Amino acid sequence: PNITNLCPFGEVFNATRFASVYAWNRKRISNCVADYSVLYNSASFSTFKCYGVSPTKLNDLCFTNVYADSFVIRGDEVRQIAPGQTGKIADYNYKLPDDFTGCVIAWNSNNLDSKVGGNYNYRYRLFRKSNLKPFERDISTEIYQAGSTPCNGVQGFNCYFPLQSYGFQPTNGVGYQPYRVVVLSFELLHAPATVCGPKKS
């Protein structure tokens, strides 16, 4: 071969604005050469916690149609993003399958997504009728009935708004400051593989 073709990880990691967890952003990646070495050696990333694939052998494997899902969550909830985990956002906002083969990266963003008056532009789902299937996205905004009476879309007794905002502040302690999370999913279907790392000469 000769000089390679880069893959655009800049527009997914260094984006100015992310999206709330209840509407987590999804991106598809195909026909590119991905270099995970620069991601592994980076010191900024706090959590690099990926199970089914050994971290040192990403460049050797060759996949097709990689996926990247990005969002912003609280510090204490980063442990909820794992196979076979339960909580509030794990079962109501973003659920991972139990046979996951991916890789989750999480890092601190206190100086980007915080404001002295408070950043109230991040919302998450709190009430659902039932749990969520893996890799399912729900954006329905309808009043929630916790009793045995119709609500008619007005916040009465036992009728709650399903989505609730975040209260990020610059002086909050660790565990409440916003964290940015991105998960990579490696699927391998029957079509020829295209996405895998450089072949050194």
């Binding site: 408070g118 709190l126 009430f127 916790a146 009793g147 045995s148 007794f157 036992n158 709650y160 609730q164 209260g167 502040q169 002086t171 909050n172 302690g173 660790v174 565990g175 409440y176």
Partner: protein
């Protein structure tokens, strides 16, 4: 669906939105107390009036759930706090009258002024001055005059206000399913959940004197020794048969006897252990003091202190026009934010206060995982006891020598040990009868056993009997002596201070027992002991989620409140006092008085 599910959903909705508003109110209060400007006053007012104006609706909504069907205990316990009427049981007129009464009582107490007879234009206040006069002076006549002036130019107008206050608050309590206001105060010490750990409101009454009767001989011997020393003091005033007067104790009310230490030092020649000069000689700043205080807790085993505490907290010396009231406080602003506030100086008392406040911060940090409504101590007495344990354990000569303050080749002996024990006793054990008598009087007057006419006289003979304090000058019915107190004019419960000492000494004795220490209890130290730290943490992490009877089961092996550790701590002092005053007799006679 079941009611419990609706209650759970309501609580989940409530707590998350309450957290942010509470945090905003706390931040406004911090900004005001750290930077006293006019703007901050109204900012705090307008950022905190909303918190109650939000809590009111949440309290209102938490009544359609019939709290006799909920199970799971924790949900019911959490909902119990929300289902509180407060003061809404009464109409607007009575409520506003009560609020105005509280405000005018506080204003009258906080603006006291008494002028000496010869100059009716230059008065003195309860701020240093009159307090300084009755604290560190020598004349009998001026002390008596100051006592009478303070009790006749402050508490004389408080009598009608308190008389109306008693009946108004009693009516409110009766409206709130409590026949007395004493029950309303005692409701904190009540649990009606798990079997075998239950506790009723009326049981505390029977418990208080049951645990008080065992310490009577120690108080009697201390009273006899202090009276003998005061007889070596001011002549032709004390009687070797009766009990000592009121204004010679060394304070406005006699709550503490610390100011009396100078007159009644056992040896005198032996100097107390003070390392202020040594601390200065090594160039010790506030940062060093707080780092040593943190290292103590780290060595014990408690969690390491978080970043931002070293940045946001105002540790020392505001200095310039940036004024700030700096009563030493520990702030838990919520959302994982903890701070301290103090005007640190280079002195031993600052070291002890730093240890105390750091222990407060540690306890606040321990139970952060509990829900919003359960982030407190098991009862009102645990918090200060936990804070004071570290202060007690950080003043030992061994610990001071280990941090390189005292000389390495220092040796302690009988005299200095007895001196320190007496100094600590004069502050710790000399206040229990006063608190017991005051709380008993308040409960009795709330219940209504003593009528309107039998208010002051009954107060005075119960003070003469329980405490041993006589009349300098009589008061018939026109005064209200107990009303001239901070915790009585501001509507504060007073039985906390009685339980705090017993809890702290039980905790210290248990830790020393499970710390492998040999010798007298007063020289015990819990540094470099991970098992003691683990045992303490296993109870601190509980929060309010469990009854305090269960809380007093992981530190000690008995749920009841016993008083043996106190009698164990002051054992050398007691055995010295037994052979010290072998001629004078213990006890007092209630008939003799200074004026009759």
């Amino acid at each position: 669906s079941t009611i419990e599910e609706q209650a759970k959903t309501f609580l989940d909705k409530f707590n998350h939105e309450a957290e942010d508003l509470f945090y905003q109110s706390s931040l406004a209060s911090w900004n005001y107390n750290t930077n006293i400007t006019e703007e901050n006053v109204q900012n705090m007012n307008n950022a905190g009036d909303k918190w109650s104006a939000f809590l009111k609706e949440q309290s209102t909504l938490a009544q359609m759930y019939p709290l006799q069907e909920i199970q799971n205990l924790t949900v019911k316990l959490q909902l119990q706090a929300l289902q509180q009427n407060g003061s809404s049981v009464l109409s607007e007129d009575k409520s506003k009258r009560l609020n105005t009464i509280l405000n005018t009582m506080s204003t009258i107490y906080s603006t006291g002024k008494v002028c000496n007879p010869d100059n009716p234009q230059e008065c003195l206040l309860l701020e240093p001055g009159l307090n300084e006069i009755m604290a560190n002076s020598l004349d009998y006549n001026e002390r008596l005059w100051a006592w009478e002036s303070w009790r006749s130019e402050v508490g004389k107008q408080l009598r009608p206000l308190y008389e109306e206050y008693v009946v108004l608050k009693n009516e409110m309590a009766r409206a709130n399913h409590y026949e007395d206001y004493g029950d309303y105060w005692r409701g904190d010490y009540e649990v009606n959940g798990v079997d075998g750990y239950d506790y009723s409101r009326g049981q505390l009454i029977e418990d208080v004197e049951h645990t008080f009767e065992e310490i009577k001989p120690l108080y009697e011997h201390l009273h006899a020794y202090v009276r003998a020393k005061l007889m070596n003091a001011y002549p032709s005033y004390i009687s070797p048969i009766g009990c000592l007067p009121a204004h010679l104790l060394g304070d406005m009310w006699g709550r503490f006897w610390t100011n009396l230490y100078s007159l009644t030092v056992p040896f005198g020649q032996k100097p107390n252990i003070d390392v202020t000069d040594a601390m200065v000689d090594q160039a010790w700043d506030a940062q060093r003091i707080f780092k040593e205080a943190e290292k103590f807790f780290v060595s014990v085993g408690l969690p390491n202190m978080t970043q931002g505490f070293w940045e946001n907290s105002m540790l020392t010396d505001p200095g310039n026009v940036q004024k700030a009231v700096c009563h030493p406080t520990a702030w838990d602003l919520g959302k994982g934010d903890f701070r301290i506030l103090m005007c640190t100086k280079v002195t031993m008392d600052d070291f002890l206060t730093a240890h105390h406040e750091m222990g407060h911060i540690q306890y606040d940090m321990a139970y952060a995982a509990q829900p919003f409504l359960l982030r407190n101590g098991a009862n009102e007495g645990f918090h200060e006891a936990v804070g004071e344990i570290m202060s007690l354990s950080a003043a030992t000569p061994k610990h001071l020598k280990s941090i390189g303050l005292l000389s390495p080749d220092f040796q302690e002996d009988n005299e200095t040990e007895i001196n320190f024990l007496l100094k600590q006793a004069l502050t710790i054990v000399g206040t229990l009868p006063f608190t017991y008598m005051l709380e008993k009087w308040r409960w009795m007057v709330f219940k209504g056993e003593i009528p309107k006419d039998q208010w002051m006289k009954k107060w005075w003979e119960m003070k003469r009997e329980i405490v041993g304090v006589v009349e300098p000058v009589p008061h018939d019915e026109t005064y209200c002596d107990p009303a001239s107190l901070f915790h009585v004019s501001n509507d504060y419960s007073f039985i906390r201070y009685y339980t705090r000492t017993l809890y702290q000494f039980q905790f210290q004795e248990a830790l020393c027992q499970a710390a492998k220490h040999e010798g007298p209890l007063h020289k015990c130290d819990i540094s470099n002991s991970t098992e003691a730290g683990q045992k303490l943490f296993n109870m601190l992490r509980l929060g309010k989620s469990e009854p305090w009877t269960l809380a007093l089961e992981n530190v000690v092996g008995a749920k009841n409140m016993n008083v043996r550790p106190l009698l164990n701590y002051f054992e050398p002092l007691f055995t010295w006092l037994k052979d010290q005053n072998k001629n004078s007799f213990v006890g007092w006679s209630t008939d003799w008085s200074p004026y009759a």
